Amino acid sequence: QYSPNTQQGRTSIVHLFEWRWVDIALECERYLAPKGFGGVQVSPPNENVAIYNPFRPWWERYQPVSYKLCTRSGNEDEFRNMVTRCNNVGVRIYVDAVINHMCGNAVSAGTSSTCGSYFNPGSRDFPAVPYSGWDFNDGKCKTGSGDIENYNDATQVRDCRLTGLLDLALEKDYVRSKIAEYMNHLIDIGVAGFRLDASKHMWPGDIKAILDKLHNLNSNWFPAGSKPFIYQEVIDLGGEPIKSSDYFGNGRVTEFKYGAKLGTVIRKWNGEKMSYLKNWGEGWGFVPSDRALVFVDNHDNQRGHGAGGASILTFWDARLYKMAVGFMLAHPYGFTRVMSSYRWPRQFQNGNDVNDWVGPPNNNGVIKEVTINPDTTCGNDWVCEHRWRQIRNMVIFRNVVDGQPFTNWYDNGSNQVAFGRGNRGFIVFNNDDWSFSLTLQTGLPAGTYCDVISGDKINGNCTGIKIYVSDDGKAHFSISNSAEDPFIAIHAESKL
């Protein structure tokens, strides 16, 4: 469960948030495969409630109506087509599994669903599954509202409704089986793993029981005995009885402390600075590296909607963001996931974004295709961070140095730091208000290297900064605090 099952040598997955299956299929073949991306986290592929007030918000996909693979991203055939094409070029598919609940208990009954399936939240009926009142936690939940009211009580957190979302009775074999039927279908079709949505809201033992029902990965694309990759969403910042470590027996866990702290250090909040990153990882109270699914931001907290506070860096903070993503992709801690977003009319009032509900780019509710501009960026308001040179090249950097140890660390006691990965890569950052010019021990073989942040290695030459490593492994680096990208990265494959 702990291994991502990526093709040998690919170390990251990208969240193609709200992308349609056809666009992802094309992206796997045209970009993800040749660029060394390990896989794609897709938005919930199962039928959800079609919410028109507000107009088709992104969060309506976390309110299940049935397990039919029929959503705004595409139908069942378009989904399989995507998984097949991606696997065929060595790019995996990870499904965002919303199995803790169905839709909000107050949503009106009817067929306002992405596949037209009828459902009645009030009578607890979801015939397409089918689920009835017997399959929810109404009787089990102990709170006066029926919703989660206090996180200091690990029981209600698991048995009561998360913000009114109908809570499935995951202890019942019937429910566990309907969920496993949905997940095994996806596995046999070729999916490599799953993001278990709202895991903090499910008992570690219930998740385990469902996982016991899961098959090994498709034997035509994967080695015999391959278990699906499992990363459970648990936002554990340390002040609750529930700890993300309680879920290690099922797989990895999202380490939300990662982006929260990387955000405060890079934003230099509360006197924090990059020199403190020397012992980044478990030293910061994070889960063990082999149980961590890391990221700078995720679909929820990039709109302040999730957890990490206002410290979370996003594409809106492009400059600091690329640097945050760069440090993450260079550091050996955890399995990395890069975010890929769409732009929305962010509108702050009294400090809160009133348009944080806005769904993906669309025409009358129909999600827009991802258009690729000549410079390889995306149109139709898709940000495509995974396509930014500075990020895509660090995804490659991670592949190149995989297995190499963290060493040759340096810091000026402030915000100018650097470190290497064995003898295959070196990265330097300058987040101080003054220039950084110094000769550093890179641990790399002598030669000329292309800086992959400011440029690329192309046809035997560099399009950007060039770094010269001497026989003693030393190299001079110069980074202005006013540079477009205040960090430089070189590796075994960017060497001339």
Verify binding: residue 96, Cl ion, rule CB under 5 A. Answer: no
| DSSP 8-state symbol, 442 | -
The answer to whether 335 and 256 are in contact (CB under 8 A) is no
Spatial separation of the C-alpha atoms in residues 196 and 174, rounded to whole Å? 19
Residue 167 interacts, among Cl ion, ligand NAG, Ca ion, none and using kind-specific CB cut-offs from 5 to 8 Å, with Ca ion
The interface partner of residue 461, options being Ca ion, ligand NAG, Cl ion, none and the CB cut-off 5 to 8 Å by kind, is ligand NAG
Q: Which residue has the tokens 């040998």?
A: 8
The long-range contacts involving 50-55, CB below 8 angstroms and separated by at least 24 positions, are: 50/112, 50/113, 50/114, 51/107, 51/112, 52/112, 54/357, 54/358, 55/359, 55/365
Please name which of 335, 314, 369, 258 lies closest in space to residue 21, comparing C-alpha atoms.
Answer: 369
List the structure tokens of 43.
Answer: 């938005």
By a kind-dependent CB cut-off of 5 to 8 A, residue 460 interacts, out of Cl ion, Ca ion, ligand NAG, none, with ligand NAG
- Pattern of binders to ligand NAG over 44-83, x per CB under 6 A? ----------------------------------------
CB 211 within 8 A of CB 199: no
Q: Which stretch binds Ca ion (CB under 5 A): 5-13, 52-60, 154-162, 313-321?
A: 154-162
CB of 458 to ligand NAG, least distance (A): 9
Query: Is 158 marked within a binding site?
Result: yes
Is 197 assigned a catalytic role?
Answer: yes
Binding partner selected for residue 350 from Na ion, ligand NAG, Cl ion, none, CB under the kind-specific 5 to 8 Å limit: none
**Beta strands 447-450 and 348-349, pairing class:** unpaired
Q: Give the list of residues 6+ apart from residue 351 with CB closer than 8 angstroms, or none.
A: none
Please report the DSSP string for 7-39 in residue order. -TT--EEEEETT--HHHHHHHIIIIITTTT--E
Active-site entry in 27, 125, 206, 233: 233
- In sequence order, which residues have a C-beta less than 8 Å from that of residue 461 and are 6 or more positions away? 450, 496
Tell me the window of 243-251, 276-284, 410-418, 454-462 that interacts with ligand NAG (CB under 6 A): 454-462
- Candidates 8, 270, 459, 482; binder of ligand NAG (CB under 6 A) is 459
- Span of 60-68, 76-84, 123-131, 453-461 interacting with ligand NAG by CB under 6 A: 453-461
| Size of interface with ligand NAG, in residues (CB under 6 A) | 3
Residue numbers 270-299 binding Cl ion by CB under 5 A: 298
Q: Which of 461, 468, 480, 484 binds ligand NAG (CB under 6 A)?
A: 461
Q: Which does 254 bind (CB under 5 to 8 A by kind): Ca ion, Na ion, Cl ion, none?
A: Cl ion
Which region, judged by CB under 5 A, interacts with Cl ion, from 91-99, 249-257, 318-326, 421-429?
249-257
Instruction: List the catalytic residue out of 197, 206, 236, 456.
Output: 197
Please state, in angstroms and rounded to a whole number, the distance separating the CA atoms of residues 34 and 36. Answer: 6
Asked if 458 interacts with ligand NAG (CB under 6 A), we say no
For the window 91-120, what string marks contact with ligand NAG as x by the rule CB under 6 A? ------------------------------
Query: Catalytic annotation on 206?
Result: no
Q: Sign (positive/negative) of CA torsion 199, 200, 201, 205?
A: positive
Is the distance from CB of 168 to CB of 100 less than 8 angstroms? yes
Nearest of 354, 357, 362 to residue 381 by alpha carbon: 362
Interface residue with Cl ion, options 197, 233, 432, 451 (CB under 5 A): 233
Contact of residue 201 among ligand NAG, Na ion, Ca ion, none (CB under 5-8 Å per partner type)? Ca ion
Judging by beta carbons within 10 Å of its beta carbon (0-12, 13-18, 19+), is residue 348 exposed, middle or buried?
A: exposed
Binding site for Ca ion (CB under 5 A): 100, 158, 167, 201
Residue list, annotated binding site for chloride: 195, 298, 337
Which residues are known catalytic residues? 197, 233
